[PDB]
Write a protein that binds this DNA or RNA. Structure first.
Ligand SMILES: Nc1nc2c(ncn2[C@H]2C[C@H](O)[C@@H](COP(=O)(O)NP(=O)(O)OP(=O)(O)O)O2)c(=O)[nH]1
Ligand SMILES: [Mg+2]
Ligand SMILES: [Mg+2]
Length: 427
DNA sequence: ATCATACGAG
DNA sequence: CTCGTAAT
């Protein structure tokens, strides 16, 4: 009881932009606002692949990884914004710059770990303690949480907003505002700060976002998706047993692939909560020492992964696929594309160095050969001593000359090219 | 025929 | 080091 850790030591939030790429295009082109719309890359093949979908468009069934032509069938009036193309490939610069706008605002409030182009984890433990000291023992008004949902409430003895208020009222009524060490109280204050954060992001960028507040990253991330869009959700330690009782295992971060599938099949279970019935050693025996320990604690709502203080991406890369009959087959083609990638990379690296006082020191070159099922067929690295596209492209070629078979021909033909800058050091 | 863009195991 | 897995 007393010596049992409950994983209520920190206050962690996850802020994720709503239909991010769409909002970026909607801010730029007002004609797209408040309409069914999506972001697509590469129109020629089947209308292009959809990578972002507005909530209005989702109502029609449009989704990610869908061909625009097919989406148009579900939603005839679907509006489409195209990803920029430069040097023969998709260019995501607009989205990276928009992401920076958001990350910089969040970093004002606390240490953040950039988890993706549109979301970041926030460690609000220190901020809440400071906020708690201020306005000590004074009741927290519901007005301070206009967009917050308390998971699992209301409970006990017909409109969604009405439902939200009810739950919120039960939560606040129950709170013990006098004990500054109360974990629930701490989450509540964290929620207040996140309201502030989200208001700042929308006021200063025009972008709306959702957020999750909890004691760790997995629960915060999970909480965030519960009430999107434009809403934030508080998931307390106490709400975990009921929340996890019907939560499919694949919903938890890092359990959506093979590992999650193995848990389900080896253990013969479907929901996260069903994991509590196994001993740590049992879980370790099936999924390894690290995975077993993590599952044992996670199914109980406990996780110790820290919010890493990293606002910038660790790598800068450029990659292009060349499907089916379009696979690269000549020396001239390979070199041309390597140069295109090398040029985009060079501009991206030069800007990075000027903005972030760092320089990449290693260049990674990856390819795929036709007939290979894997994402990558081969990976090779070389020094990156100069930010020059011509040198990097030539170095890259040198590095992959070995795969080619004789004949100016290239074979087997290449289905993918990838250049990635890595191993940054201060500059 | 989606594509383009961190981390642990060995 | 390269590779496989994973999320967005
Ligand atoms: N190329 C590509 N880009 C993607 C993919 N998935 C996501 N993105 C890009 C495009 C996305 O807009 C952005 C954010 O990823 P989310 O947060 O997963 N989705 P969103 O923010 O759109 O909606 P909401 O969060 O409200 O559900 O990342 C993909 O599979 N491929
Ligand atoms: Mg998002
Ligand atoms: Mg996201």
């Amino acid at each position: 009881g007393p010596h049992m850790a409950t994983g209520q030591d920190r206050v962690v939030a996850l802020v994720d932009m709503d239909c991010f790429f769409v909002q970026v295009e909607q801010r730029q082109n007002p004609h797209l606002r408040n309409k069914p719309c999506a972001v697509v890359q590469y129109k020629s093949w089947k209308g292009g692949g959809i990578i972002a979908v507005s909530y209005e468009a989702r109502a029609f069934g449009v989704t990610r990884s869908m061909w625009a032509d097919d989406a148009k069938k579900l939603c005839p009036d679907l509006l489409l914004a195209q990803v920029r193309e430069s040097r023969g490939k998709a260019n995501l610069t607009k989205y990276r710059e928009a992401s920076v706008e958001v990350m910089e605002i969040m970093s004002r409030f606390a240490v953040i770990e950039r988890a993706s182009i549109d979301e970041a984890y926030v460690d609000l433990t220190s901020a809440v303690q400071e906020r708690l000291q201020k306005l000590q023992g004074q009741p927290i008004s519901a007005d301070l949480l206009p967009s917050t949902y308390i998971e699992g409430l209301p409970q006990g003895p017909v409109q969604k907003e009405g439902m939200r208020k009810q739950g919120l009222f039960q939560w606040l009524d129950s709170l013990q505002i006098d004990n500054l060490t109360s974990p629930d109280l701490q989450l509540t204050v964290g929620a207040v700060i996140v309201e502030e954060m989200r208001a700042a992001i929308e006021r200063e960028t025009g972008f709306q976002c959702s957020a999750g507040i909890s004691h760790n990253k997995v629960l915060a991330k999970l909480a965030c998706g519960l009430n999107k869009p434009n809403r934030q959700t508080l998931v307390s330690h106490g709400s975990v047993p009921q929340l996890f009782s019907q939560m499919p295992i694949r919903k938890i971060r890092s359990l959506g692939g093979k590992l999650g599938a193995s848990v389900i099949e080896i253990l013969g279970i479907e929901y996260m909560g069903e994991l509590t019935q196994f001993t740590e050693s049992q879980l370790q025996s099936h999924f390894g020492e690290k995975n077993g320990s993590w599952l044992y604690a996670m199914c109980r709502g406990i996780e110790h992964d820290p919010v890493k203080p990293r606002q910038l991406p660790k790598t800068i890369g450029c990659s292009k696929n060349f499907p089916g009959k379009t696979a690269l087959a000549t020396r001239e083609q390979v070199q041309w594309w390597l140069l295109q990638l090398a040029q985009e990379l060079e501009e991206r690296l030069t800007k990075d160095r000027n903005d972030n006082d760092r320089v990449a020191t290693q260049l990674v070159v990856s390819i795929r050969v036709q007939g290979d099922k894997r994402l990558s067929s081969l990976r090779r690295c070389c020094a990156l001593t100069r930010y020059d596209a011509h040198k990097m492209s030539h170095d890259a070629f040198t590095v992959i000359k070995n795969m080619n078979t004789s004949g100016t021909e290239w074979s087997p033909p290449l289905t993918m090219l990838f250049l990635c800058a890595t191993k940054f050091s201060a500059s």
